[PDB]
Amino acid sequence: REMGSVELLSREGEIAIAKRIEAGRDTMIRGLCESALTFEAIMVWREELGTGRILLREVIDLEGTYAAIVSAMEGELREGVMAILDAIASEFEAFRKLQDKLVGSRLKGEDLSDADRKAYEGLSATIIQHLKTLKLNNNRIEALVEQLYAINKRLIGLEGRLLRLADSYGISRGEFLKAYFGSELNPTWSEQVKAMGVRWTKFVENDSQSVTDIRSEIAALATETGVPIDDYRRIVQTVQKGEREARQAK
Amino acid sequence: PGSATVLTLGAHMCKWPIGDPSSEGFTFCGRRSSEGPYCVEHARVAYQPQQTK
Amino acid sequence: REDALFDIYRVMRPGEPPTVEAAEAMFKSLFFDAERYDLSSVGRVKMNMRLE
Ligand SMILES: [Zn+2]
């Protein structure tokens, strides 16, 4: 009954569903190859590969390499991957340095605007272009997606706890994200956000003053363990959206 | 071509793909197609029209 | 007749959703089909004797 009265036979829409799955995979790959721990983990893991680690069949699919171009194809793709890693090592190091500088500026308060963001974007774009054209496999992609989902679940739990602690009198849950997106650099976010509303002062004093501090400490501890803050959130969000679209198409 | 990319796809919107996902320009319709994955005509053509069984 | 076919389909197969042509095909395969409703010649002669 569910199959019949509810589901409709997709006639000539198989190719459309395949294209939708391909688009979802493209979205997931684009969200993965960005300035976060995924690009660093895929770059650091690929640094050991090629010479003494698994260079092919575990990082980049052999079919995807020569798809647009067995023994000859294996050695050809291996040398190309090694050259790409050797050329992108400096870009990945610069991107990691820029991410560390941005995390320090966000944890201290000072805004790094003297070309720091420009250098970070320039170092991240090179790594993204190198990873996208590398045609990597899904083996490490699965672990990266799992780590991103775990980090996103932890962040969502922390945000929900903060919302439940701050929404006692007259606060809501949807405003917590809007407040933390623009009031995350300063450590006294709950103190410098008391512009209007009497419920905010009561929620910040004796209501959630310790909950907000615990959430900020957890976020600071999780930033060093993996990807930093303010950059990995949107990355995991877009990768989760792509995975959800792919699962819906399937 | 459509008016919505693969990222700005919200709920109650068309999802019929146009073009090649591995190409440069690949977007969807992105119109009022609530209560259905695709739009009216695309869902009709994809849902095995003239259903008599 | 469509309502009667739907009722017959619901009685025979309540879980399956009755259709316009599906219900008409069910009754035909049940009684109007000699492949399933294989009434022997003795049955037909007994019917002809009971009711002329
Ligand atoms: Zn459409």
Token output for A42: 């895929």
Tokens 């995350």 locate to: A184
- Do residues A230 and A102 touch, judged by C-beta distance below 8 A? yes
CA dist A68 and A104 (Å) reads 42
Report CA-CA distances (Å) from A231 to A243, B11, B14, B33. Answer: 19, 25, 30, 33
Cβ distance A166 to A211 under 8 Å? yes
Q: Which residues pair with A60 in a beta bridge?
A: A136
Nearest to B17 among A16, A25, A242 (CB): A16
How many angstroms separate the CA atoms of A16 and B18, rounded? 8
String of DSSP letters for C18-43: P-HHHHHHHHIIIII-TTTS---HHH
C20-48 CB burial, b ≥16 within 10 A, e <16: eebbbbbeeeeeeeeeeeeeeeeeeeeee
User: How many helices (H) and strands (E) would you count in chain B?
Assistant: 1, 2
In the beta sheet, which residues pair with residue B32? B13
User: What sign for the dihedral angle of Cα A213, A217, A222, A223?
Assistant: positive
Structure-block tokens of residue C13: 């197969």
Alpha carbon of A180 to those of A209, A225, A229: distances in Å?
15, 20, 11
Residue A247 alpha carbon to ligand 1 centre in Å: 19
Interface contact flag, C15 A5, Cβ < 8 Å: no
Tokens representing residue A78 in the block: 């291996």
Q: Does B45 touch chain A (CB under 8 A)?
A: yes
- Resolution limit in angstroms? 3.8
**Chain A 224-243, CB below 8 Å of chain B: which residues?**
238, 241-242
Technique used to solve these coordinates: cryo-EM
Q: Which other chains touch chain A, taking contact as 3+ CB pairs less than 8 Å apart?
A: B, C
CA distance B46 to chain A (A): 5
Residue B43 known to bind ligand? no
* Gap between the Cα atoms of B40 and A111, Å rounded: 50
Residues 6+ apart with CB under 8 A from A248: none
Burial class (CB within 10 angstroms; exposed 0-12, middle 13-18, buried 19+) of C14: exposed
